Structure formats: C-alpha cells, structure tokens
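Annotators were shown the component list below and the corresponding predicted structure, then asked to write short factual statements about the assembly.
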Amino acid sequence: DYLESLDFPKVVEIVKKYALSDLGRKHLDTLKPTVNPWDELELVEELLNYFNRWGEPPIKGLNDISQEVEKVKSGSPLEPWELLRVSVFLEGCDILKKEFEKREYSRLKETFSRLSSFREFVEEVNRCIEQDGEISDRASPRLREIRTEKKRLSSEIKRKADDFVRTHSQILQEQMYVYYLFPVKASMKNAVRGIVHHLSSSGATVFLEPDEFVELNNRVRLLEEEERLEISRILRQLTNILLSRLNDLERNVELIARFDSLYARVKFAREFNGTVVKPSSRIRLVNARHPLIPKERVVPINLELPPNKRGFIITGPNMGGKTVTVKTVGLFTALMMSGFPLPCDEGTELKVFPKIMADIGEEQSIEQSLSTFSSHMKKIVEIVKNADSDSLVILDELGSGTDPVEGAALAIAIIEDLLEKGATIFVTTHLTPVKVFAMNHPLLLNASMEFDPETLSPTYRVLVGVPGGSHAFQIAEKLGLDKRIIENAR
Amino acid sequence: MDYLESLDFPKVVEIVKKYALSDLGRKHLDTLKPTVNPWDELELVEELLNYFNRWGEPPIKGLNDISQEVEKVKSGSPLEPWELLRVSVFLEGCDILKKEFEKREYSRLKETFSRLSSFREFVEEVNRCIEQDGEISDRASPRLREIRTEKKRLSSEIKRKADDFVRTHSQILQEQMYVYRDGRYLFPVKASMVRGIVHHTVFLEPDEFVELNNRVRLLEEEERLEISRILRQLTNILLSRLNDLERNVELIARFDSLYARVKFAREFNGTVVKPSSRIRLVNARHPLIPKERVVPINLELPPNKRGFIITGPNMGGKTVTVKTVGLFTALMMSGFPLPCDEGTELKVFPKIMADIEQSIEQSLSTFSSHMKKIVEIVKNADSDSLVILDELGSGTDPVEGAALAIAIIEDLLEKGATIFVTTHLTPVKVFAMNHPLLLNASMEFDPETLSPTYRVLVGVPGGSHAFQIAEKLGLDKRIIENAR
Ligand SMILES: Nc1ncnc2c1ncn2[C@@H]1O[C@H](COP(=O)(O)OP(=O)(O)NP(=O)(O)O)[C@@H](O)[C@H]1O
Ligand SMILES: Nc1ncnc2c1ncn2[C@@H]1O[C@H](COP(=O)(O)OP(=O)(O)NP(=O)(O)O)[C@@H](O)[C@H]1O
Ligand SMILES: [Mg+2]
Ligand SMILES: [Mg+2]
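Structure shown to annotators:
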C-alpha cells in the first residue's frame, strides 16, 4: 500500500475532523486516486466559492440516521426519538436543496436537486410528537379522548385514596398511598377486605388493594392499555410514510454523505488556505505546506520539475526535510487525484499519474522474514516490475540498509531502470555516487535542503542544482549527544 | 517503542498466555517483568516442570476466573445461586490443588500453595442449600420447606374448592368455568351478584377465595424473603474469610501463570535458565519463528569481552540474533523458561536498553528516531547495562556515521556496558578487531545456494552480499548486472 507510505489516510483523517456526521466520514474514506477527478474537484471549487460568498450553508439537522433507516427497512416501527431524528434530518435535506437553487453554482445545483422532499412526513411528526419525545394530544382524537378519560378517572381514585387515608389512619403505616394501593400494617391486615399484592422486606407492610379500589384500578389500567395500543398505531402510521418511500430516503442519506464529504473538504481548505488544483502536464509546487506540520512550524516548499527532466534526487542534512518534501509530491498528487483541495498557493500544478508508487519506511517482522534491506527491496521489486510511462515513483533512502558501495551501485541501476521505463521519480539519498550520477545524467536534477551555517540548523528551503551533505555531527549535537562523543568523532 | 517492545517481549508473552486456564493467569502473566532477583520465580517453574514429567498435569477442575464474584462480595451485594456454585467449585479446586502438592516433594510449590485456605464449610453449605440446577433445596432451612409444605398443601386446596364452587353455584354462573389471573381465582357470575370482590357476566372473587388467595400471595412473598435470608447467610460465609478468599484468587492466578509457562516450555522444549556470570546461547530458538523454519543459534560472549559486533548478509539474521540475546535475558529475569538447550547461560542486567526506526512528522526522521534513542541510552548506561544497537551508524553518510558509531560504542564501553550491535560499515568492523573489549561475529552465507544459513561464525567479520540477496528477492538480473 503506497498511500499509507505517503501519509494519505492521516491527511484524510484531518479532513474528517470537519465532517458534520459519520456519513461524510465514511464517504471521505471512499475517495481514492482516480484518473478522472475533474468532477469531484469542480464540486469542491463550487462550494468553496459558496463559502466565500454566502458563508456556511444550512447544516442544521444533518446527522447520521443510518441506524434509523435500517430499522425502517427491517419493517420495525421507529421510537418517538428516532422519528424526531429522521424528521429534522429530512427537513435539513429540504433546506439544503432549496438553498442551492437560488445560487449561481451549477454542479452543486444539479447534484443535490436529487434530494427528495419529505415535507409531509416532517409535518405529521412535528404535530404528533413533541420535542421531549412524548406523543402530543394533537396526534389523534382517540388518544386525546383516552388521556382525558384516564385523567378524569385518576382524579377520582386520588380523591377516594385521600379519603381512605384520612378515615383509616390507624391501619396505615405511612399515612399515604403507594404506586394505586395502601401501606397497611400486618396484624391489622384482615381488617379491610382487600387484595394482597406486596410484602415489606421486614414483614411490616402488606401493600393491600382495598375492595372499592379493585375495579377502579382495573378500569384505569385498561385505559392505559388503550393509550399504549393507540400510540403503537400512531408510530406505525408514521414509519410507514418512510417505508413507502424507502428508496427516496436512502438516496437522501447518500447525498448528504456526499455533501458532507464536500463540506469537510471545503472547510479544510479555508483553515489551511487551500487551493483547488486541477490536473495539468507540469509538476510545480508553489508555497506548498504539508498539512501534518503545525502552521507555526511549517515552511512552504517551492519546487518545479523542468519539462526536460524525469528525476529529482534530494540530498541534504539530517532532519532537513528531504523525506517530507519527497512525500509532498506523492501525497498532493494522490490528494488531487482523489478530489481534495491542497494547502498551497495559486499556480501550483500537478499531473495525473495512473501508477503512484512509494518506497518509504522500513518494517522489521520475523514472521514475514522482513528486514531493513528486505522490506525496502521487496517494494523495489514491486515497483520495478510495474513501473512504466504512467508511473510516479517515490524512493526514500535509496541504497540504505547495506554496504554503502553496493547500495550506491544498486541505487544507480534502479534509477536507470525506472528512467529507461519512462517513469517519473523522486529520490532521497545520502550516498555520494548517487549525487554524482544525478548530475551526470541529463534526465536527473539535484537539489538539497538548505543549511544555515551561523545557526547550525536546517531552514527547509529547496535549493535546486546544488547537492548537499548530512551534517551529522551538528544535528547529533542539537539532538542532545554529549559534546564529548562528538569532539571525539570529529 | 520502549526497550521490551523492541525485543518483541510482549509478543512472546502473548504466546504463553494461550496456555492459561483462565483470565486469572492471563492477567498475571502480564505483570511479569525483568527483575533483579528472579530466582524464586524460576525455581517454581522448574519444580512445576518436574511435577509435569513426574505426575502429569496437576488437578485443575474449577479454577476459573471468579474475580467478578469476589468483587460482588466486596460491594456487600449477595450472590445468586449460580454465582454460589461457581465460587464453591473454585474453592473446591483450591482444596484439591493444595492437598496434591502437600503429598509431593516440591518445597516451593507446597509452601507457596500452603497459604491456600480451603472453605470446606462453604462448599458443604452450598452443596446442601443450593441444588446443581440452581434451585434452593428444602434442607436449606427448616422454615423454607415448612413454607413450601404449606404452599403446596394450600395450592391443592384452593383448586379443589374452586371446582366445588363451580359445581355448587351453577345457577348464578354465566358459564361453568373458573378464571385464573394474577394469582387469583375468578368466577363468571351473572347479574345475580355471592359477596366478594369484582375484578372488572361479572368476574367475581368470592369472600372465601379472597382470604384464601391472599394466603397464597403471603406464602409466596414469604418464600422470596427466606431465600434471600439464605443467599445472604451464604455470601457472608465468604465475607468472614474475605482476606482468605482474595488471597485464594491470587494464589490460583500465580499457579495459572506457572501452569501456562510449563505448558509453553513443554511445547517448545524449554529450559529453565537461571542467572549466571556469562552469556552463552546453546541452540537458542526464537519463539516467533515457525518451528519447521527456525535454525538454533549458538553464541557466547567471552569473559574478557564486553562487545559483540555482528555483521553479515542482508536477511542473514544479524538483528534477530542480537535481539535473541536481549529477549532471552528479559524473559529469564521475568520468570519464564526459554527455548534453548541445557547449557545456556544468561546474566542479570538491571538495565536493558535496545535500539531496534520511526518516521513521524513531529520531528522523527530515520536518523532522528535512532539518535534520539541513543542519547537516552548514553545518558543512562552504566556498569550493569545490557545494550542492543541495531544498524548502528545508518541514516547518514557512511563516513560521519562510522565516526559516530565508533565514538558511541567506546563511550558506552567506557561506562562498563555489555553491548550487542549490528552494522555494515567497514570502519566499525575494523574497530572491533583492534579493540581488546570487542569481538567480531558474522552470520554464515552459502555461496552455492546464494542464501544465508543463520549460523553465527565467531571471530571473523562478514559482508552484506546485497547483489546476491537482491537477486534472491527478484530484482532483475540486468539491474544486478548494471550494478556489478
Ligand atoms: N517544509 C517544512 N517546514 C517545516 N518543518 C518541516 C518541513 N519539512 C520537514 N519539517 C520538519 O522536519 C522534520 C524532518 O523530516 P525529514 O523529511 O524526515 O528529514 P530528513 O531529511 O528525511 N532526515 P533523514 O531522513 O534522517 O536524513 C519533519 O519531521 C518535520 O517535523
Ligand atoms: N535463526 C533463524 N532461523 C530462521 N529464520 C531466521 C533466523 N534468524 C533470522 N531469520 C529470518 O530472517 C529474517 C531476517 O533477519 P534479520 O535479523 O532482520 O536480518 P538482517 O541481518 O538484520 N538484514 P538487514 O538488517 O536489513 O541487513 C528474519 O525476519 C527471520 O524471518
Ligand atoms: Mg528519511
Ligand atoms: Mg535488520
């Protein structure tokens, strides 16, 4: 997997932090390098100008209702709190579709005009169900009647109960009523003709239902079952509105996922000062800023591959930015080809590469017989076998992991093989014969990361044409190595 | 990665955890870490290894993870009948494990598992009150079955009286039947409404049946009150010996970790290596390498030598070998046996450091990830430090990296550290043969088969053989030809 070597999912995860739901999160994970990304980029470019013009678009209610949609598809009825979620999400779909028709943005308009209006469903839910989740009296007249009769009956028992309390103050432990039954004391149990239900943990209370309370409690309990039965009919009738338009609802959920993936990419562009770069025939970075470096630390990278060139060998000091710069070419190419905007300045150009390959990093596994040399070389054999004119190749620390005289000879032959095959390559190295082969070969270009002599530090500037060295002693000193060991080394 | 992670230590501990009887031993195996005095831990493994070959597997039935039942007691809550049976079978598994070790000749086993306190009374009180299926027997208490005798005798009586009421009151009954609902006998009386309670033809409960159906409800709630009285009296038997109980759960966890280590050594042909004064691997087999693929490793650090410099072919085993010295040392100090031969010697090192590269955009490069660790190791290396340095000097130009590798090795040798390194830089190789504290080693390569053999050749330096190994991994011959 070459995208992982170029930190591709780490940058997508940065974009996913702006998604308004886990719908766009899942859809962003579907965006991978394609040969024809123009439609995806123009959609990002359209919503980008939208933000600059009219600000953030309407987004209230655009939550992840994937679970609720499956429950309807499964045939089950939705709970009142689920119908509220689906409704506020469907009303959000209505506002989003409407808002994209009064504006100038074409591709946004034709794409999300495919949303399905559920204005009928949103009205029934807002009429039957209130904000806290209860069923409103306005739902059905039948429920309205049962509640009135249940309240009228419950007001009678509570009046009769307070009469039983004031008149039977000698048989009651606590002078009250419970749950509708009475806390009568045992021993004084057979005093009132009634039905025994529950006993106290010490055998003191006999929680009894008096004679004149049995049929009344039963009438109230039937009214409650009537209320429960009517609510289940109200919820079924509401969920059926969604069941009858299941395809319309599932299309609304995918379109919000797509819009959410576009919404996250646009807000990523404004935080990082992004630019929508489209496939060109040149590779030029203009003040490119790696999204994984903090803004306070990042130094923009300027690089341009001349048209008469095919390879870029990068040398320079340790921690000078050789690998990061080589990563930015592969990453930004894979990002544009996926449909993402790029943290760079206007004028940046990149080129569609059907084959993007990278050899970055070393893996040590005993199980996979993986060694420093083996993990690199097993990728090299992969790349060499499939490198052609459509291939862009990123080779990090070519020739490292073995005898320097043999690694530098392997490094030069591999570069030669990719060049003959018509591949575009970006290479880091710290071996001298590789630097020499780069300036001897007319298809190769040498560049180095800048090193400040007075400050003994890297400046992260790309100097084209000049090779550079590792400066290992000054970097080891900055990394904390004792001055004793270094003065010894020099 | 920390030092133990660089040596695949937790990956190996994961192998032994597969042999545990329960999560009691899996959790305890996660606590075993390199200690300076591992003698008792290793002697217990050896004694249990002796027991296995002598008497077979020890008694193990009932030694499940009952940690949750022990915590429920801690919270004062009473335990359900099935929880009573789980704990009762664990404690019985403790009494059979104790009695088995006391009749043997393994001191540290008996002595350690003597602190096992047996709950013979709790086992007998659970087996008498609780039945195997989870029901409450009648011997549980004299009141329990007096209630059940009166409940059974009453239940047969109301039903007989219900049938009599139907047959003797047909004139007032809509249909000849009785209704049972919510534990009450109900009768379909016509408008000719017999005194009693009407539960919503009128469904009527005659006054005779009101007091009788009541008595049914009282006796059923009295049974529930008595079973909880017993479930609490049962739980409290353990609470009076809760310290004995929690000690019993740890002692079984310690046994389970021993049981797992013995089963691991028994399966990998393991040897209990104890601390010595020297380092010598006699046919060491790295446990992460498949059994039908590993080649045993032989290696020995001479007593006048404190640095092992391993060179040789790419994919030749330089790293895994030097890793094996560090891993087998850490495992030994943690109480584990080792896949090696009788004769292997390892030495206790209170400080174990390793270097085996991270690449992260918060200032970690190839050179940085290594050198950031080196500065940490140099800062803390002393006379009892075992230091493992993989690919020392890589990540820079060959010239300065070689001068940095030599200065670090000799700075660490001066501190008194024992050091195992891998390298492929010629100046480091030459430094190893000219310095009195250094020894040069190399992994063998077969020229005919053009493949490494993973045999340690001591005394001579070696070579990477990149061209041949790149050929064995598939790189086209024309690239290799252009390289040579
Ligand atoms: N353009 C940049 N602006 C700011 N910081 C940067 C830039 N490029 C790199 N860095 C930082 O510097 C570090 C050096 O990264 P890296 O590219 O691996 O150096 P390197 O040249 O590869 N060192 P090495 O591979 O060991 O020879 C990165 O991890 C970032 O933290
Ligand atoms: N004794 C052994 N028996 C069997 N397989 C082994 C043995 N030692 C090593 N291997 C295998 O060989 C692989 C290479 O080992 P490794 O120690 O990484 O070589 P290396 O010398 O470090 N190569 P490099 O570091 O890139 O120069 C390991 O991942 C194992 O799969
Ligand atoms: Mg690097
Ligand atoms: Mg290695």
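Statements collected:
1. Chain B touches chain A through 71 residues (CB under 8 Å).
2. Residues 344 and 451 of chain B are 28 Å apart (CA to CA).
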